[PDB]
Amino acid sequence: GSSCQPGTTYQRGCNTCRCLEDGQTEACTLRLC
Q1: Are 20 and 27 within 8 A, CB to CB?
Q2: Backbone dihedral angles phi then psi of residue 5, each to the nearest 5 degrees
Q3: According to UniProt, where does the site described as Reactive bond lie (predicted)?
Q4: What's the angle, vertex CA 14, arms to CA 10 and CA 20, rounded to 5?
Q5: Shortest CA distance to 21 belongs to which of 3, 10, 29?
Q6: Angstrom distance (rounded) from CA 22 to CA 3
Q7: Which DSSP symbol is given to 5?
Q8: How many CA atoms lie within 13 A of 23 on its CB side?
Q9: Three-state DSSP class for 28?
Q10: SS in 3 state form for the chain?
Q11: C-alpha distance from residue 6 to each of 14, 28, 33 (Å)
């Protein structure tokens, strides 16, 4: 398995994240929480 499952969506605390196609990178929002 990779560090995230590509295409999955979840939260990191108050931020929303998406696992990118390489399963080793994620796109998150920029809230301070």
Answers
A1: yes
A2: -80, 115
A3: 30-31
A4: 35
A5: 3
A6: 9
A7: -
A8: 6
A9: strand
A10: CCCCCCCCEEEECCEEEEECCCCCCEEECCCCC
A11: 21, 14, 25
